[PDB]
Each structure stands twice: as C-alpha cells, then as structure tokens.
Design an enzyme around this catalytic site. Structure first.
Site, PDB file in Angstrom:
ATOM      1  N   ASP A 119      -3.623  -4.664 -18.161  1.00 19.24           N
ATOM      2  CA  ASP A 119      -3.964  -4.723 -16.751  1.00 19.24           C
ATOM      3  C   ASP A 119      -4.977  -3.637 -16.395  1.00 19.24           C
ATOM      4  O   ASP A 119      -4.745  -2.452 -16.653  1.00 19.24           O
ATOM      5  CB  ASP A 119      -2.688  -4.569 -15.935  1.00 19.24           C
ATOM      6  CG  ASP A 119      -2.930  -4.579 -14.463  1.00 19.24           C
ATOM      7  OD1 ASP A 119      -3.884  -5.250 -14.018  1.00 19.24           O
ATOM      8  OD2 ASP A 119      -2.147  -3.911 -13.751  1.00 19.24           O
ATOM      9  N   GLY A 141      -1.285  -1.742  -4.084  1.00 20.80           N
ATOM     10  CA  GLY A 141      -0.471  -0.775  -3.373  1.00 20.80           C
ATOM     11  C   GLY A 141       0.394  -1.409  -2.301  1.00 20.80           C
ATOM     12  O   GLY A 141       0.385  -2.622  -2.064  1.00 20.80           O
ATOM     13  N   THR A 143       1.874  -8.616  -9.848  1.00 21.76           N
ATOM     14  CA  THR A 143       2.998  -8.149  -9.045  1.00 21.76           C
ATOM     15  C   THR A 143       3.569  -6.893  -9.683  1.00 21.76           C
ATOM     16  O   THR A 143       3.934  -6.902 -10.862  1.00 21.76           O
ATOM     17  CB  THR A 143       4.071  -9.235  -8.935  1.00 21.76           C
ATOM     18  OG1 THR A 143       3.471 -10.422  -8.408  1.00 21.76           O
ATOM     19  CG2 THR A 143       5.198  -8.801  -8.018  1.00 21.76           C
TER      20      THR A 143
HETATM   21 NA    NA Z   1      -4.989  -7.988 -14.576  1.00 25.69          NA
HETATM   22 ZN   LIG Z   2      -4.825  -5.039  -9.685  1.00 34.21          ZN
END
Ligand code: NA
Ligand SMILES: [Zn+2]
Ligand code: NA
Ligand SMILES: [Zn+2]
Ligand SMILES: [Zn+2]
Ligand SMILES: [Zn+2]
EC number: 4.1.2.13
Lengths: 292, 292
Positions: free
Chosen positions: A82, A166, A239
């Site tokens: 990520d 956030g 998420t």
């Molecule tokens: Na991603």
């Molecule tokens: Zn992101």
C-alpha cells in the site's frame, strides 16, 4: 491460495462488486481480517503500508500472511503493498512475495507518474505481480486516466474523486464526484480503487468515545457513498482507519475498567472481535460476501 | 538457530549461569524478546503456554519463531511448551516443531507423575525434543527428585522451592529454600528450572502505577534471590509477568496521554521497548549475556 491481485479484482470488475482492502500491522489485525473473510465467504485483499512493513519487517509481513493462507486455503488472498513510494520499495515487495504492489506517484506531473508506473509495471508483471497506480490529488482527469492506463498497462487505478486518508476526510459535507468516476470507468475498463474509504460507523464511533477517546470532529465516507462508488466501478476499497478505531476502542475499554489487567489476550481478544465485525459488515456492504 | 532445549541448558548447567525463558503471545512480545537477545549476545528460551498457543494457533506460534530465527541465525533459540497439561498437548507441540516441551504433572502422586513424564519423554526424545517436568507443589523431596530424574530420563527438572506463578508470589516475605535446591542439584546433576521467577522490579512497578495501573500489593522474587538461585543450580528461569506488566504499562500510558491516538504502533512500539529492556537486564543478571 495467495494469488495475484488482478485475479481477485478482475472478477469484482466483471461482476460489479467491491473487495475491501484491509491494512494490518501485526498478528491481531491479520487474524481478525482473515476470520472475517472466512465467516463471510469473501475474498481478501490484505494490505501493508511501507510503515507497517518497517514495523513488522517484510519477512514477518509475508510470513504471517502465508501462514494464515494455509489456515484458510479456500479464501482467495492478495498481499498488497500500500502506497509504495519508490521503484525500489515495490521491487523489494515483489521479491519478498507480495502479489500486488501500489506505486504512488500522483504528486508528480503526468509524464513522470506514467514513466515511473510503467517501470514498476514492467518489473512486477515479469514476476507475476499486479500493479496499482494513482491519478489526481486536484481530481482525476478522465482523459489522462484513459491514456495512463493504455500506456502503463497498470492492472488497477486509484482515481482521485474526493476522498482522503485518515479520520478527518470532510470538514464540510461528504461529496464524491461520481460523474467523474463513471467517466474514468467508461474510458479505462479496468478495476478501480478507492483510497481513504473508511466510514467511521456510528457504533465504532460510540465505542471509541464511550472508552474516553476523542475523534476530533472526525468524518468518514457514508455507507451510501461507498455503495454508490461500487455501482460507479470501484472494485477495491482501501480500509484502515475504521479497523484501528474499532480495535483501540476495546483496548482503551479494558484498560479503563480493570487497572490490574495486564494479560495481553484480555486486551486484544475483544479488540480482534470488534475489528473483525467491522470487516464483516464492510464485506457485506461492498458485495464481496459469499463470492468465494 | 532453532535448537533442542537441552543444547542450551546443558551449556548453562556446565558453566553455572541461568537462561531466561520468556513467554510470548504475539509478534510484539516475540520481537522485543529477540531484539533483547541480539543486543546482549544471549541464547534465547522462547516459551508459549497452552493458552498462548490457543490464542495464536500453534502454526503461527511456530511460524513466527522460525521467521525470527532466520532473522537472527546466530542466536541459539529453543521453542518451549510451557506448562503442558496432557501427553496429547506435548505431542501436538512436538509435531508442530517445538524443540522443548514441559509436562506438568506435579499435582499427581510420584508414581503417576513419573509415569506420565516417562511417556512424554519417550515420545519427545524419539523426535529429538527435550523435556521438562516438575516436582513439588509440599516442596520438592530431593531423594524423590533423584529417582524421578534417573527413571524418567527427563532433561531438566523444575523443583518446588518456594516460588509461584503470577504477581502474588509472597503474601509475606520472599523466601526460597536454597538448601533444598542445592541438594536436588547435587543428586540429579541436570539443568534445573525455576518457575514463577518474575521479580517485578521497582522501575516496572513505577511505570505501571504511573500509568494508572493497580498491582494489588504484588511482590516478585528479588534480584538477589534470582542470582542465588542460579548459584544454587537453576539454569532456566521462567519469566512472563515482568514482561506483561512493562508492556501494558506503556499501552496504558499512551491511552491516558492522547485520547485521539489509535495508531497501533504508537501504542506498541514503546511497549516493545519496555519489554525489551526488562529482558536485557534479566539476561545480564542471570549470566546469559555474551554467551553466544
Ligand atoms: Na493501495
Ligand atoms: Zn491511501
Ligand atoms: Na516451563
Ligand atoms: Zn492515495
Ligand atoms: Zn510456571
Ligand atoms: Zn509450575
């Protein structure tokens, strides 16, 4: 079955549902995410940020996931980097066993973003790994997305349409550019990714505040907005914040109600359950439940 | 490397030092224990109780340890089943990859304790695994320990000489029967194990109380008693409570001081540091530092 991310998201793309992409930083998060997918019969995107990888060490990030996969071999699982920031980070993930990598260069101009993404794509595709990229910050230019996807051969794309990471996404009213999303989907015809997709449900909010926490006027994406995103072509829904608030809410609770409690399982077993229930409900909302 | 329990404790037996046996229940505990051993150049006895195994699952317990051993291949590591209660439990640990197993039958009479221990030993030794057993609850009978070790062929023995698990060791004054310890050691001439050997040091109690925690007048084994135990022949020093208090002390601290904090690493990075420091100090106290 640890599989390339595109194997999962091409199915979601063809069938028009969304697959939650759930971040983890340790065993308790990973366990709860897998148990959720097992109980909802849902495929899983498991994500690790560069920061989480530094915390666990990449060997333990991949190691724990591979153990969990053998525990639940019937669940399609992709292991996804990520917000990778450099080619070298993506390459290290590829070599360590990640089955999907995201390279985020949305802060560069179009030409530099496309160049760096294409370099990653060439590297990851040669190793049988899928690639995510990002366009927009400024919302996505649908015509840029069309050329970007054709030129880069990226497997999925995160178009900016009004979200942000956030717990504090909107200081006003929640709004996402669904018309823009639909245009991108029409022109690219690939799986699309929604970043900053935590919703902060009411029950999770109540649990955190009831435990003495403070969310500082937080505001997430409404459930109906997430549902509308999937209808618009989002197939991967990142998420994270939701999982953390639900988890720590229970840790704060145990701490408050028993000052002589220092058994880690007494803190983290209810924390896992709360996280798991968030994941389960999200899989149902997004339409990945019962898709195995 | 991941080695037979006896390989570590026979060295400690012949050289007259103690090797801490540190319990873990998740990645954060294991990581901090391993970093402690790497920084003190100390062999590691990693312990998992039956409850810990149920929490993590035995596949993850072993899997995480093997990952850590490959990360620090220069450290001798034994993976130990703490307080196994049945033959079948010891057998599952052996099959899963544990290199040491404890069978706790000290609540049975001598003949039944000896019989169950001998059965575990026969199974474990056939699979190249070391075995711990326990005698005493009345404190240990040294002549009984002599025949117990001779008949069972157990690799190390935990003789009851005054300690007990948990933070409520001494309702009054700490006192260990060192004369009884020396006699057991003289007659058995094997590595010995000290159960319930957490000290609850001043700094850890201070940190826990400052974080709003309540220890309920807890009292551990003084450092002087631990060193005297090692001088008397203790080579494995079971340590759990100290690690959990120091860990949860930091967790409570982060929660008290920032109500908007729900990043798990902000809670557990200081918790790992505190646990690591307890371990490092214990390794130096017991004499395992600089023994690699
Ligand atoms: Na991603
Ligand atoms: Zn992101
Ligand atoms: Na033990
Ligand atoms: Zn982003
Ligand atoms: Zn014990
Ligand atoms: Zn015991």
């Amino acid at each position: 079955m640890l599989v390339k991310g595109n194997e999962i998201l091409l199915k979601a793309h063809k069938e028009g549902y969304g697959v939650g992409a759930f971040n983890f930083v340790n065993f308790e998060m990973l366990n709860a995410i897998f148990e959720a997918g097992n109980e909802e019969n849902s495929p899983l995107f498991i994500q690790a940020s560069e920061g989480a990888i530094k915390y666990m060490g990449i060997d333990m990030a991949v190691g724990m996931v591979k153990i969990m996969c053998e525990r639940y071999p019937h669940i399609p699982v992709a292991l996804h980097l990520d917000h990778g920031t450099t080619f070298e980070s993506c390459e290290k993930a590829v070599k360590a066993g990640f089955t999907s990598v995201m390279i985020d260069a949305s802060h560069h101009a179009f030409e530099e973003n496309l160049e760096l993404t294409s370099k990653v794509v060439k590297m990851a595709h040669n190793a049988g790994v899928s690639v995510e990229a990002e366009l927009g910050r400024v919302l996505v230019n649908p015509k840029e997305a069309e050329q970007f996807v054709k030129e880069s051969q990226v497997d999925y794309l995160a178009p900016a349409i009004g979200t942000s990471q956030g717990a504090f996404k909107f200081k006003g009213e929640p709004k996402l550019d669904f018309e823009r999303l639909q245009e991108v989907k029409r022109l690219t015809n690939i799986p699309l990714v929604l970043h900053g997709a935590s919703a902060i449900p009411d029950n999770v909010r109540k649990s955190y505040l009831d435990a003495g926490g403070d969310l500082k006027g937080s505001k997430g994406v409404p459930f109906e907005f997430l549902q509308e995103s999937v209808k618009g072509g989002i197939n991967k829904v990142n998420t994270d914040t939701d999982l953390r608030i639900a988890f720590i809410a229970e840790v704060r609770k145990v701490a408050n109600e028993d000052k002589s409690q220092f058994d880690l399982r007494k803190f983290f077993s209810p924390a896992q359950l709360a996280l798991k229930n968030v994941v389960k409900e999200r899989m149902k909302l997004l339409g990945s439940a019962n898709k195995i």
